[PDB]
Symmetry: C4
Subunit: 315 residues, 4 copies
C-alpha cells in the first residue's frame, strides 16, 4: 500500500490537482499519470463510485437535450414572441420544456462563470483542451441570447436557440470520456480538428475564394455574378455536387472550364485526398497519446466529481 | 508422427473442441492453433475431404438463394395472400421455389435451435463471433414470419420475406471461410464493423440528429418541417447528394447555410475521412490476427463437418 | 569485367532467358535480377540502344491509336456496312486510317499467335503477367471481329471496334515500362487490381445483387421492377449519385428505406473505405517488389528487342 | 561562439549562399542546414528581424490581392476597353485599384526579370523549386497581357486578367513558408503534386480520353457526338456527378453501359483510391524531408531579405 495521504496534501495542492490543472506547457502533463500509484488510485475511484455519478450526469444531460429539442420542434413560431399560452396540454408541455431548457442553460452558464472565477478566462483561452467546458458556456450563451430576443419581440431568437441546440448535440460527445474507446475516439477527433482540419481549411478557403472571384469576374449575371452564390457553386464540387455547366453567362467558355478544372484538381482531388493521407499519419503519431489524454480527461472528471459531490467520504 | 489420439480424447473433450468452443475470454483462443501438430492435422482434414463437403454445402446454399430470389421476383403480389395457383408452368415453378425457400429456412432455423440446445443463447449472446450462425437463424426467422403473415392475409409478409432474402445474400459471405484470402478478407470486414464502423456511427448519428433538429427548427414547412425528411436531406450530404438549397422555408438564410456548412465539414469531411484513417490503422493492427482467426474459423467448420457428417471414419 | 559469355550461352539457354521465361512458381523469379553482373549488363543494353528502339515502338503505337481513333470518330455509321467511299479527301483519309487500323490489329494478332507457337496458350493462361501481351491479342481480336461484321452487313461491328479502341488506350500503359517510375506505378496498379480490386468486387457484387433483388421484390413497377434498372440504381449510390427516393412503387416505405440505408452503410461507406485501407497496406507490402518486377519487365523487353531486332551485333 | 565571419565570406561566396543557390543535384542540398552553427544563426536572424519584414511583405501582398480582386469584381465589362471613367467615387476607386494592380504586376515581373538577369531562365527551368518565384512572374505576365488586350480593344483581356487573379490567390501560399507547419504543409503539397498527382494524371487522362472516344464512336448525336462534351460526361463520374444514362443515341445499350462501368471501376474506384493510398505512402516517405526543405525555404527568404533590405547592419 502506497502512502495515499501524500496525494491528498490539498492543504498546499493535491498531487492529482497539480496534474489536473497543469499548464499545457508542462512536458509530462499527460505522462505524470503513468505512475502506478496514481493509476491504482484513480481506477479505484472510477469503479468505486465516480462512474456511477458520471453516468447519472450524462443521463440527465441527454434528457435535457431531448427536452430542449422537443420544445423547439413544437415551437409556435407564427407571429412574434413572447407567445401566449393557451389552455392545452401541448402548450403546457411546451412551456414546461422551454423553462427547463433555459434553466439548464443557466446552470451550465453559471458553472462556466464559476470556472472563470477560479480559472480566469485569460487563462482558459490558453488551454485548447479546457474548451470542452467552454463549449457548454457558449451553448448556454446562445440560450440566454434567445431568451433576450424572445422577450425583445425579435423572432431572431430562433436562430440563436438553434445554435444552442446544435451546440448541445455536439457537446454530447463530452460524455464519451467515460469509456476507454469512445472517449479515446473523441480525443482523436479533437486533435485532428485542431491540427489537420484547420490546417486544411486554411488553404482550402484560399483556393475557394480565389477561384470564386476568378469565375465571378467572367460571369455576366445569371445570379452567379454575386460572389456569394458562385463560391457556393465551387463549394459544391467538394461535397460532390458541383456542376461544371452551372452557368453560361460569359464570353470565355474555354477559360471558364479551365478554371473549374483547376479548382477541381487542386481542391477536390489533390487537397481532399492529401488531407486523408495526412490524417492517417496523424493517427499513427497519436494512437497512444490519445489514450494518455483520455486517462487525464477522466482523471479530471474524477477530481471534479469528488470536489463537487458534497466532499463525500472516501479512502 | 505425433500421438494424435490425445487430440481425439473426446471422452472428456477433444483438444480441438477445447479450442473451438473456447470462451472469447481465453487469451490464446486463437494462438492455440499455432501448434504444428494441430495445423498438420487440420490441414490434412481440410484437403483430405472436408473442403469437398464444404464446397458442396456452399453450392447447395447458393442454389437455395437463387431459388428463393426467383420465387420473390415472380411473386404475384396483386391482392392478398395466400394466393391461388393456376394451371401454368410458371405457377408450378413459383410454388416449388416457395416451398423450397421455406424448407431451407426451417432447416437453418432448426440448426440454430440445435445450437441453442447445446450452446444456450444466453451463452451465444456473449460470443460476437458465433453471430455467423445467428445470422442464419435470423434469416430463417424472417422467413417464418413471412409464412405466418402470408397465411394471415397480411401482405406485410413481403417485407419480412425481403429481409430474409437480403440476409441470405449477406450470409453468402459465410462460405468465404473456405479460402485463405476471401475468408481472411471477411474477417477483416467483420472486425472493422464491430469496431470502427459502429464507433463511427455512434457519433455520426449524434451529429446527424442534432443538426437535423436544428434545421427543422428553422424550417417553416416545405415538407421538411417533418424531421424525418430533414434528417434524410442531411444524410444525403454524406452519400454525396446533399443539396445546400433543398429549402427556402425560413427567415434565417445565413444561419441555415451556416448549419449546413458545419454539418458538412464536421461530418462529411472530417469524420468520414477520419474513419478512413482509423480503418487503415485497424488494418495494420490486425493483419496477422485476421489470418489467425480465419484458421480458427476453418477449424471450427472442420470439426462440425466431421461431427455432423455421419461420424465418417478417418485417421 | 565479368565473363559475359556465360550469360550468352543460348545454345542451351541464356541466363537472362532462364529468368525472363521463368515460371511464376520460381521463388527468385524476380530476385535473380539483383545480381550486379546482370544489372550492369541490362542497364548497359537499355541505355546503349534498346530504349531508343523502345521509344520508337511506343511512338509508332501511339500513332496507331490516334489513327484508329480518327477512323472511328469520322465513321459514317449511317446505313449498313460495308460503306461505299465517295470521291472526297475525307473519305480517302478515312479508309486510309481504317486499313491501317486493321493492319496494326493483324500485326499484334500475329505476334500473339507467334507467342502461342512458342509459349503455348495452355502455358500463357498460367502466367498472370504475360497478360500484358494477351491484351494486345484481345485488342486485335476485337478488331478482326469488327472486320467480319463489317463485311457481314452487321452494324454490330461498331461495338466490337469500340472495344478494340478502348483496349488500345488501356494498352498504352504497356509502354510505361520504359520509365523507372511510370512502369513501377503501372506495376502497382496491376497488382492492386489482381489482388484488392477483384477481392472487393467479389463481395461488392454480392451485396449489390442481393439488395437489388430485395428492393425489386418490394417494387410494384415504375420501370424499376426490372432488376436491371434497380441494380443500376443501387450502383449509383457507390458512384455518388444514388437517389434514396428513386421510386414510390411499394407499400413498405419504411422497409424500402431501411434496405437502402443498409446497402449504403455496408457498401458505400464500409466496404469502399475498407478497400482504400487495404490498398494502403498493399502499397506498403509491395513498394520494393514493384520495383523488382519493373526491372524484370524491362529486362524482358530488352531481350525481346535484341531477339527480334535483326540479331543486331552487340557486346 | 562560432566564427560567424567564415559564413559571411561573401567575397567569394557566403556559406549560406552556397547552400541557398545550390544545384538540385547536390546530395546534401537540404542536409547542409542541419549544422548547429547555421541553425543558430538563421533562427537568430529570423526572430531578430526577418520575420517582421516578412510578415510585412505578406501583409502588403494580401492587400494587393484584395485590391485586384475588387477591381475585377466591379469591372464594367459592358462594351469594349479601354473604358471611360465617369465622375463618380466608384469609378475613381476602380481605376485606382486597376492602376495598383498593374503596378504590383510590374513589380513582380521586374523582380522575375532580375532573377533571370542573375539566375538565368535556362538555369531556372532546371530548378523545380524555384518555380515558387516563377509563378509570380507568370502571374504578372497574365497581368501585362490583359493590359495589352485592354488597350487593344480586346475584351479577351478579361480572361487573361482572371488567370492572373487566380494565380495570385494560389501564390498566397508562398508566404506559408514563414510558419513551421503551414510552410511544411505547403511543402507536402508541392511534392505530392510534382510526384503523385502528375503521375496519376498521366494515366487518368489516358483512360479518360480512350473511353471518351469509345463512347463517342457509339454515339449518334445528342450533342454528345462532340468528343468535347462526352469527355466531360466521363469526367463527371470522377467528381461524383456522372450520369450513366446521359444519352440514348446508340444502338448498343449494353455495350454503352459496359464501357461506362469499366471506366468507373478503373478510374473512379480503382485509380482514385490508389492515388490516396500512394499519397499516404508518400507522406510517410517525406515527413522529415518536408521539414528539412521548409527550413531551407525559410533560409533562402532570410538571405534575400538581408540582401534586398538596404544591406541593413547586423551581427
Amino acid at each position: 500500500l502506497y502512502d495515499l495521504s501524500c496525494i491528498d496534501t490539498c492543504e498546499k495542492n493535491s498531487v492529482l490537482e497539480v496534474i489536473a490543472y497543469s499548464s499545457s506547457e508542462t512536458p509530462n502533463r499527460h505522462d505524470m499519470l503513468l505512475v502506478e500509484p496514481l493509476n491504482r488510485l484513480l481506477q479505484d475511484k472510477w469503479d468505486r463510485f465516480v462512474k456511477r455519478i458520471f453516468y447519472f450526469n450524462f443521463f440527465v444531460y441527454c434528457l435535457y437535450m431531448i427536452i430542449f429539442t422537443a420544445a423547439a420542434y413544437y415551437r409556435p413560431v407564427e407571429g412574434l414572441p413572447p407567445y401566449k399560452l393557451k389552455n392545452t396540454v401541448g402548450d403546457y408541455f411546451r412551456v414546461t420544456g422551454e423553462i427547463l431548457s433555459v434553466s439548464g442553460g443557466v446552470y451550465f452558464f453559471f458553472r462556466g462563470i464559476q470556472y472563470f472565477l477560479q480559472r480566469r478566462p485569460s487563462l482558459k483561452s490558453l488551454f485548447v483542451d479546457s474548451y470542452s467546458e467552454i463549449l457548454f458556456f457558449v451553448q448556454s450563451l446562445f440560450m440566454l441570447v434567445s431568451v433576450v430576443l424572445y422577450f425583445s419581440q425579435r423572432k431572431e431568437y430562433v436562430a440563436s436557440m438553434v445554435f444552442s441546440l446544435a451546440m448541445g448535440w455536439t457537446n454530447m460527445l463530452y460524455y464519451t470520456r467515460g469509456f476507454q474507446q469512445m472517449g479515446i475516439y473523441a480525443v482523436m477527433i479533437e486533435k485532428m480538428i485542431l491540427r489537420d482540419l484547420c490546417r486544411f481549411m486554411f488553404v482550402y478557403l484560399v483556393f475557394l475564394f480565389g477561384f470564386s472571384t476568378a469565375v465571378v469576374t467572367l460571369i455576366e449575371d445569371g445570379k452567379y455574378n454575386s460572389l456569394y452564390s458562385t463560391c457556393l457553386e465551387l463549394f459544391k464540387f467538394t461535397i460532390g455536387m458541383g456542376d461544371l455547366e452551372f452557368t453560361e453567362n460569359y464570353d470565355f467558355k474555354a477559360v471558364f472550364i479551365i478554371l473549374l478544372l483547376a479548382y477541381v484538381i487542386l481542391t477536390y482531388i489533390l487537397l481532399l485526398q492529401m488531407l486523408i493521407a495526412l490524417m492517417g499519419e496523424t493517427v499513427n503519431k497519436i494512437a497512444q497519446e490519445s489514450k494518455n489524454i483520455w486517462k487525464l480527461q477522466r482523471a479530471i472528471t474524477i477530481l471534479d466529481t469528488e470536489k463537487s459531490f458534497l466532499k463525500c467520504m472516501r479512502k
